Structure formats: C-alpha cells, structure tokens
C-alpha cells in the first residue's frame, strides 16, 4: 500500500503545475488542498517523508507509458438509447453479436442505421445497429456484447445479412443506410 501512497504524491506533484498555468479550476485547487492534507495525514501514519516518495513514484510510474481510425454515426444518442419491445421476439446470438428482431411485423419498409468506427476502408467494431420502419417503428438490433473476443467485419456482415433475411421472410422490404450501403 506503500506504492499508492508513491503514486499518489508524484500524481499531486504532478497535479500542481496544471493549476500553477493554465485556467485552473476552484474545485481542482480545493482538491489539490485536501489532497496534500490527507497526504501529510498518511505521512504521518506511514513516517517517511515526501521528498523520498515522490522520487519512488517517479520510477514506478515512468514504466507504464505506451491504426487511424475515425467515428461514423447513422443514429444519435437518443436514437440508440430510445426503449422498445419485440412482440413476438425472435433472437440469438452470433459470434459476439445478439441479434433480435420481431417475427410479427410484415409489409413494411425497413431501414437499418448503425453507429460504429472505420479504418482504411472497411469497419472495425460496430456500436450498435437498430431497423427503423418509414412510420418509425423500431424492429431489430444487433448489439456488441461484452466478451474479450469482439468481432470483425466478416461476421458483422454476416449478422446483417441474417437480419435483412429474417425481414425480408414476411414480405419486407428491407434497405440499410448509405454508410452501410458503402460499407457493408
């Protein structure tokens, strides 16, 4: 716990001259002030001084110091937060993606949006893909799921190419987004 209390003065020292210039912040100087309390509090507790921990934070930390991708979005926010039901739901999962959609809709116009990165001139990992119907209605999604694994855009096509069948079964027409279009 000793190595916290290195980390955690090199981390105030560190803290100070971000204050010491730049527009600063009243709750970051009030933190900054509890924060040496509580320090001299530990170094109290623990005896050794500052000026011989700070210099063991230097090394301990310094060790941990570290492909152009950007951002498309179809949907905002709002159109990936918004609640909905599948009536008759009809689900699975693939690789690492949960598709679901509703078996009871038929004759409708169906659109698919999807948020998710690019590199080079394909996909990377999709954030989430829902099916919109012209008289917005919500009707299927392809979600991540939280595995180490992730996915890949042969399997993401894939899981597109599922959904646009089991939509297009009851006589829905079924057309995805321009970015899709372009990319998927």
């Given at each position: 716990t000793v190595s916290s209390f290195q980390v955690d003065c090199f981390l105030w020292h560190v803290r100070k001259r971000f204050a010491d210039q730049e527009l600063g912040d009243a709750p970051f100087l009030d933190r900054l002030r509890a924060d040496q309390a509580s320090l001299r509090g530990r170094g109290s507790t623990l005896g050794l001084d500052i000026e011989t921990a700070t210099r063991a934070g230097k090394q301990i930390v310094e060790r941990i110091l570290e492909p152009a991708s950007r951002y498309l979005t179809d949907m905002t926010l709002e159109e990936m937060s918004r609640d909905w039901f599948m009536l008759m739901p009809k689900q699975k999962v693939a690789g690492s993606l949960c598709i679901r959609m509703d078996?009871?809709?038929?004759?409708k116009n169906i659109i698919l949006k999807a948020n998710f990165s690019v590199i080079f001139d394909r996909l990377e990992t999709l954030i989430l893909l829902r099916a919109f119907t012209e008289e917005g209605a919500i009707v299927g999604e392809i979600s991540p799921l939280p595995s180490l694994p992730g996915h890949t855009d042969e399997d993401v096509k894939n899981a597109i190419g599922v959904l646009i069948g089991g939509l297009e079964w009851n006589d829905n027409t079924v057309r995805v987004s321009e970015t899709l279009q372009r990319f998927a």
């Open positions: 078996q009871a809709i038929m004759d």
